[PDB]
Amino acid sequence: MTRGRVIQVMGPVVDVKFENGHLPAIYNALKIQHKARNENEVDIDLTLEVALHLGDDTVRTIAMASTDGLIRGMEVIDTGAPISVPVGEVTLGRVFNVLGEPIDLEGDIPADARRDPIHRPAPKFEELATEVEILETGIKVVDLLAPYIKGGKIGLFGGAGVGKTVLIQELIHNIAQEHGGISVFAGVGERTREGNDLYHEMKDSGVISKTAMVFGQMNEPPGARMRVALTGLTMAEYFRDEQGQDVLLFIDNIFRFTQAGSEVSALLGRMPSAVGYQPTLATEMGQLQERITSTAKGSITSIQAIYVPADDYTDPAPATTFSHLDATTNLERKLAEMGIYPAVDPLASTSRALAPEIVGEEHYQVARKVQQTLQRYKELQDIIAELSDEDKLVVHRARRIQFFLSQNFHVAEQFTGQPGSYVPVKETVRGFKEILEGKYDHLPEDAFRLVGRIEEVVEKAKAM
């Protein structure tokens, strides 16, 4: 009827032969489910994705799992649609894989739920938002020096030991508490140990009730790690379109996405491009990143971690991904070694939203003045370790400014004791302007440490 049969098996690549005029469309999902008939066989439970129509009723597909034990001639089922994952409120607090099956041993999603296809065209030109808005995170340094944009892309140049999994939790908490949004975390090419650690951290700090998680492991075939980000994307699109929320999407490494694509392209027998990448690098990147937009209903905002190969910023993969980014955020070690949290570099971090026509004129001027003062203080380090007239005042103001950028977070409360705060942009701008004018020049520098608004530093000084 509509049954295919296996013809060739070459590792993660399979060929299936169908009937005349009954071939499945490209990107569909095929299922193999075999039970051992005799003692010379094994049990098979496999899913394949259609890639090419080769002619003569033959279709070439890639596998999502291991292909050991396949026999030429086994029946193949055509589902009639791409990979479909469950969406809704049923996915909040659970962990899934690329196929939408939970991997947290808490049961199965009922068969009567609603599922959505993985592959979809981007939203049309007439359905986008005509204006540019600002996402209020509630973190002082991010909100002042590197503002976020609804529907924008941010690159996180952090690392291990700088406090990245705390910043992610803080973003989830703040967005959910103040705006009502929902978060999705997609881990592509993820070590299993680190995924376990992140899951337990989120369960400890309590944010797991507001976030969905998808994991594509390092030990999966290249086809699986290529289509994990699409599952998180289609899980977030439901909340964007059906409800109208402002949703956050985290991508753990966007470099492994391109590497998996390159491996898949090599497996299919294609002519490599410059530096050995796939010919369709830009098309694949654009098809992923053009669905993260701000329409007239809601918005999806994406924070993505980027690894730069060989410390070369002109490499094809970082050069292709940098043409979509709207902001950057760099975490650095020495800022953590001074006890400053979060350890965001205030001069390396940039954003294209720091323009007078988006944030007004007061915000812009205050930000530039803070940046110039910090640059001067950085310059004076060699001399310092009584030099001039105004340099003493510069250093006196800059120490306070640098210390006031730190903050107490709701997720560090369980380890410290302090409640943690959420500072609006107007309040932080006013506080920084007053510090610049010098209205609070008669207080000890340690009072400006891990507080919220500018009143808390005064209270700390009074009580100290």
Partner: protein
């Protein structure tokens, strides 16, 4: 003579500082050119391998 000795040591220190800065800038430009050469070599090698493999068929 003592004033002259102090002046000598100050001048030597400043000259060494300028020399170090110039060397650093040269290192930067050389690294840029090195990365260009690295990418070109990778591309050419993979192109030759695939061109050789396509000849049998």
């Amino acid at each position: 003579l003592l004033d002259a000795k102090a002046s000598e040591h100050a001048a030597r220190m400043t000259a060494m500082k300028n020399a170090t800065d110039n060397a650093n800038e040269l290192i930067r430009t050389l690294t840029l050119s090195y990365n260009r050469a690295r990418q070109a070599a990778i591309t050419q090698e993979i192109t030759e391998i695939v061109a050789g493999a396509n000849a049998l068929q």
